[PDB]
Amino acid sequence: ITLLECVGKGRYGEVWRGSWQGENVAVKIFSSRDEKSWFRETELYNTVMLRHENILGFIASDMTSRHSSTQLWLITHYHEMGSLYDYLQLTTLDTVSCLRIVLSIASGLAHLHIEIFGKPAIAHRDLKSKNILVKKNGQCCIADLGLAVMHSQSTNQLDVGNNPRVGTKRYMAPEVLDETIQVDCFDSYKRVDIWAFGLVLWEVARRMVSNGIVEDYKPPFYDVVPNDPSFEDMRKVVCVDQQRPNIPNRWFSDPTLTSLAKLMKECWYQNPSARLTALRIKKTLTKID
Amino acid sequence: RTVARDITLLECVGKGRYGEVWRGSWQGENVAVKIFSSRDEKSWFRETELYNTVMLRHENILGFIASDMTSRHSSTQLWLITHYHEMGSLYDYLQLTTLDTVSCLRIVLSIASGLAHLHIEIFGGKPAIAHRDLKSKNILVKKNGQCCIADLGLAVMHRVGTKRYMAPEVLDETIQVDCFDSYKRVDIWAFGLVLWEVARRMVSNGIVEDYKPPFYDVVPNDPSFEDMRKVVCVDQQRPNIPNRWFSDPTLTSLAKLMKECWYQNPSARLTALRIKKTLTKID
Ligand SMILES: COc1cc(-c2cncc(-c3ccc(C4CCN(C)CC4)cc3)c2C)cc(OC)c1OC
Ligand SMILES: COc1cc(-c2cncc(-c3ccc(C4CCN(C)CC4)cc3)c2C)cc(OC)c1OC
Ligand SMILES: COc1cc(-c2cncc(-c3ccc(C4CCN(C)CC4)cc3)c2C)cc(OC)c1OC
Ligand SMILES: COc1cc(-c2cncc(-c3ccc(C4CCN(C)CC4)cc3)c2C)cc(OC)c1OC
């Protein structure tokens, strides 16, 4: 493996564009603070039937050590277009491109949520536009399974893993922010994913042009919380103030954006059991034009 | 910067139901590569989770190098990479080799040292660890005459064990499964059987016993759970101490030590730290 350039550096660790056997690969080196994510991601990628066009493809995972130093590596396919977050910053979308992006994310999420009889049912727990990569075919793939929860219907087994990491604060569902979420209930984790999906739908739809109008890229709740919002800042707006992302009135002139606004509201009910399923979101997006 | 990951597999040194172990080469150095069967994937995950929790480093613990997971077309490939000990397992070594007093004590004190390191919680450190499959095939002989403990695939931090080495409370299913000290006491029982296997190969007054595994004279090869229960729990049999040991001060002391690892009552058994102290006062 040859490490050619750092494409990301944060509390998580670092991601490198590298070369391996003549192909671009992505090489994530985890921070020691996030060792439990590395192991959880490795448990998830053990599953051969996880592989899917809308899930980041795995090549290898390694833990290496000499003396008291440990390195933790995850090697994946490389997506040179970067994350959906990166992509939306300076690109606008037409109807076809906007629906292709969001259907592909719904397709990835429905694939995670639905058990294959194999691949367990999987809830992601940190869905957000930085955790979605854009592919040269205009579809996306979901990345970062370090917080994932797994459930097996045949044996009624729930594997919540061992990870004190929590979701990205800006995307946390009301029940996560107020800590009332039912921790022994697999459906609870799927419903957190649906909330976050609705927020990603909103971020994407803002960038779709209608009638010569488009919104600038903004992250969820940009208008109502401080920069670098705390857990308590988010709890205030989502749980106390019952805030949801605003729907620009220009959307109601466009049938596609009207349909997407309806879908993102059905992701944002305070009652988690009221939210749409990933399969239902996929079927709705398959029908919308 | 270049990350040279390739390991050349050179010769197979072990093949079983667990998978295979190979002598391999990395940057001109021997390493040992354990390739896991589908059957035994959980042993890879457990050892990896433990080493991700605490990077164990001790002269009498097989040295960790790497855990690798590689995506294949239709399967996941799982390798554990460690230090390579060309002399092989204690089991292997005892078949042909006899021991003198110094080599016997050096072997058993090195095993006690590695086991006490696993067992002890260090604050500030490492969690306490019980091995749960200690046996002479899971001990490697180093060129300096000391041994190291291998295979933490069943280890517990605070697959079942090899039946021949199971303590009575494991066979009669009375072990207090919620209680960490219970697992230390299971290891001490197994340690006592290993000490018997080694002691037999120590020469005194021109006499040595042939290598035999524990309970070779009372159970079949691949004994059943029931075969072991009847011997260890119902009849309360223990390995034979030969008369010739009682002419030799070292083997007399080691017979006493192994008795104190084999009490039916787990809480009566010696601790690994007490075994180390006893061994440093022998000879
Ligand atoms: C997995 O195993 C082996 C790895 C290596 C190896 C190769 N490149 C670099 C390194 C290294 C350099 C520097 C640090 C530290 C130093 C101080 N501080 C600043 C934190 C960072 C850590 C690691 C190593 C250890 C060599 C080995 O053998 C010669 C290994 O054994 C098979
Ligand atoms: C989210 O999570 C993981 C992501 C990736 C990953 C895979 N392909 C491409 C990338 C990428 C490349 C380049 C940019 C550019 C964007 C604009 N500008 C030039 C700065 C940088 C962004 C992103 C990444 C980050 C790999 C991972 O593991 C190896 C991830 O973790 C699972
Ligand atoms: C991915 O996989 C394998 C990798 C290796 C390997 C080969 N060269 C160099 C390394 C290395 C070590 C450590 C650093 C440190 C330097 C200090 N810096 C602050 C943090 C990072 C960099 C590089 C490694 C880990 C060997 C393997 O096998 C023995 C691997 O496969 C299991
Ligand atoms: C107990 O288990 C594990 C053991 C090992 C391991 C480490 N060094 C050396 C060995 C070995 C080398 C050589 C011989 C023979 C073959 C050559 N000649 C004909 C006589 C001697 C036997 C044994 C092994 C098997 C590694 C492991 O993990 C990678 C093990 O699993 C944790």
Listing DSSP states for B96-146 in one string gives H--B-HHHHHHHHHHHHHHHHHHH--B---B--EE-S--SGGGEEE-TTS-
Cross-chain residue pair A58–B68, CB shorter than 8 Å: no
Measured in Å, residue A89 CA sits from the centre of ligand 2 at 15
Catalytic residue among A62, A86, A94, A126: A126
Length of chain A: 289
Cross-chain residue pair A66–B67, CB shorter than 8 Å? no
Candidates B133, B151, B187, B248; catalytic one? B133
Resolution (A): 1.4
> Ligand 1, from B2, B5, B29: best to mutate by most atoms within 8 Å of Cβ?
B29
Q: CA of B103 to nearest chain A CA: how many angstroms apart?
A: 28
Tokens of B209: 């016993």
Q: B252 φ, ψ to 5°?
A: -60, -50
The shortest C-alpha distance from B124 to chain A (Å) reads 15
**How many Cα atoms sit within 13 Å of A16 on the Cβ side?**
18
Question: How was this model experimentally determined?
Answer: X-ray
Q: What is the DSSP pairing of strand B19-26 with strand A149-152?
A: unpaired
Token pair in block for residue A168: 């990205």
Å from CA of A148 to ligand 1 middle: 30
Classify residue A77 as exposed, middle or buried by CB count within 10 Å of its CB (0-12, 13-18, 19+).
Answer: middle
Q: How far apart are CA B163 and CA A186, in angstroms?
A: 37
Backbone angles phi, psi at B26, to 5 degrees: -135, 115
Best residue of B64, B69, B70, B78 to probe chain A, by most A CBs closer than 10 Å = B69
Breaks (C-N over 2.5 A) in chain A follow: 117
d(CA A279, ligand 2 centre) in Å: 27
Distance between alpha carbon A29 and the CA centroid of its chain, in Å? Answer: 20
User: Pairing between strand A13-20 and A2-10?
Assistant: antiparallel
Who's near A9: CB < 8 A, 6+ residues apart?
A15
Give the whole-angstrom CA distance, residue A197 versus residue B95.
63
Residues B15, B17, B19, B21, CA torsion sign:
negative
Read off the amino acid at residue B273: L
Assess whether the C-beta atom of B31 lies below 6 angstroms from ligand 4. Answer: no
Contact B52 A63 (CB under 8 A): yes
Residues forming a β-bridge with B21: B14, B34
The phi, psi pair for B230, rounded to 5°, reads -65, -40
CB pairs under 8 A between A and B: 67
DSSP A206: T
Token reading at B217: 């004279």
What residues contact A10, with CB distance under 8 A and at least 6 apart? Answer: none
C-beta atoms of B51 and A63 within 8 A = yes
A62 catalytic residue (yes or no): no
CA-based nearest residue to B140, from B80, B85, B58: B85
B41 vs B129: CA distance, rounded Å: 20
Q: By C-alpha distance, which of B8, B119, B14, B9 is closest to B56?
A: B119
Q: Cα angle at A24 between A139 and A31, to 5 degrees?
A: 90
Cβ of residue B83 lying under 6 Å from some atom of ligand 3: no
How far is B108 from B279, CA to CA, in rounded Å?
Answer: 8
How many CA atoms lie less than 13 Å away from B28 in the CB half-sphere? 0
Helix H or strand E encompassing B19: strand B19-26
Nearest residue in A to B51, CA atom:
A63
Q: CA–CA distance from A42 to each of A73, A171, A235, B94, B222 (Å)?
A: 10, 24, 32, 39, 35
